[PDB]
């Protein structure tokens, strides 16, 4: 129960979009349904692009964290120098 | 025997073949044996086919049971509302032990309001102190130290610059409603705030008992 | 009808031009789609705030736009856009702020965390006794978790370390660039002893802990008498503080008195 | 789990996504321009496209979750290193203040 609820994790939005598409298709006014399907597919394309952008942002954040770790190593070296100064 | 031959016969081409097998199984409307004869991709395709068929009766329910080999709604709503967007302010006093301890130890030091403002912002950020409780503790320290008045008045003016003006009114109303069901210090604080025009008379007057 | 989508993409590329070319909800939906698309174009290739302001002045969408942008823009334009939203003054705002709080490290973004929370509020060699260090910071761990003061060995070790540490406190008798969190300095170990504010931190934590404990979940009568006696000794120690010891003690007394009122959970 | 990292490492996935979206657009244009056998074939291909889209969305969401988790772990490591460096700097500052 709780495990599946947690694994559900957005995902609900894409699932609802796919479900609405399947429902409209099973129902298939037809031009309006095709246009709604096109709207849903464009929304899904925007969601895929957003996921790709989020992955790129995570990669850039990892790179920045590596740079900050190098900076913290330099700060520890400066702390040893300040220990000599102390 | 055509079904057995089709099953024995059959990543673009592989995905196409898997989708074709799923479509054939959907058009079937015993297949479990052939499914187990050959994977995790097969299990995922079976789950997708079951979801689509549920989207697209008794026969379908029986097929799902064979292939298997209300309060939940509110529970999921609570789980998502807690995980995704929780207030998580550590309001009262004792949740953030280090936080309020260091806050009061910073307010009670020997006696520059900008430095204390930045220190309080840093403490809020590090220990997740609720802003309203911070303002309450500040007002109380202002009560117990009635010598340094203008300093805390500039601090209260700068702090309320970054908050809603009606927070002070409601907080004073709470601190007065507590004693309803009232020392001189409480009245002194409200009088000082009213004099320097920090809060209007209407809200405080409404909060009073008589 | 997709001709209307093309017309919207055209007339959207200052504000009065699109305001006039717009002269029904499906059209608004296609326009929001075009807004998202051009925002994606901008972020791939600031002006995003300009477009969000244009849409807001046209008026929904802008909250979704800010959410997507803050999910995309990692650090700096994220700060600029957050300041912009601060200047702008529903649940989407809460989602954005929570995602930001979950992304920040609280290591060098502390002031930014404070700003986010304030906005959320505006919404609604040398001989070292390593064993003494162990005792002190295990006491600190007890401070971190109050529920640990209910078992037998836990409460016993807490009492032992507390008695030893307070005995050292009383026997010290001092009689005399910002650190937000505690600094566990195994080589210094001593400059925190000389600071009276450090002792104030420790004793105020003690007082809040005892106040919560007095407010399962039951105690022994001997333990409660121990709590009262230690409260008295803590007040004695706070009085020993050279700068207005008794004034500070009375201030903390008023604080912890108001604490009882705050414990009434004024949800109404 | 290595299969997910391999598929994420090696834009081609987004191109195949957009190509299947073009396929689905061609099929819905065929249905809008349009026999029961062709309608059933077409519907089967549309359902296959929908299933492929669902699987791709699930894979992308899982990859995003894993990436965010790794980033959070790196952030915690950097914060620990920064706290150690801050303790060192506090020690140096207090030693300069006492001396």
Numbering used by the authors:
A (entry chain G): 6 to 14, 23 to 41, 45 to 102
B (entry chain B): 14 to 23, 39 to 57, 72 to 80, 83 to 100, 107 to 119, 142 to 183, 188 to 257, 262 to 290
C (entry chain A): 10 to 22, 29 to 38, 44 to 65, 71 to 84, 91 to 120, 133 to 167, 227 to 278, 296 to 334, ...
D (entry chain E): 38 to 47, 52 to 75, 80 to 144
Quote the study's own text.
Newly made messenger RNAs are processed and packaged into ribonucleoprotein complexes (mRNPs) and recognized by the essential transcription-export complex (TREX) for nuclear export. The mRNPs are then recognized by the conserved and essential transcription-export complex (TREX), which requires its DExD-box ATPase subunit UAP56 (yeast Sub2) and the mRNA export adapter ALYREF (yeast Yra1). TREX subsequently licenses loading of the mRNA export factor, NXF1—NXT1, onto these mRNPs, which enables their nuclear export. We show that mRNPs are recognized through multivalent interactions between the TREX subunit ALYREF and mRNP-bound exon-junction complexes.
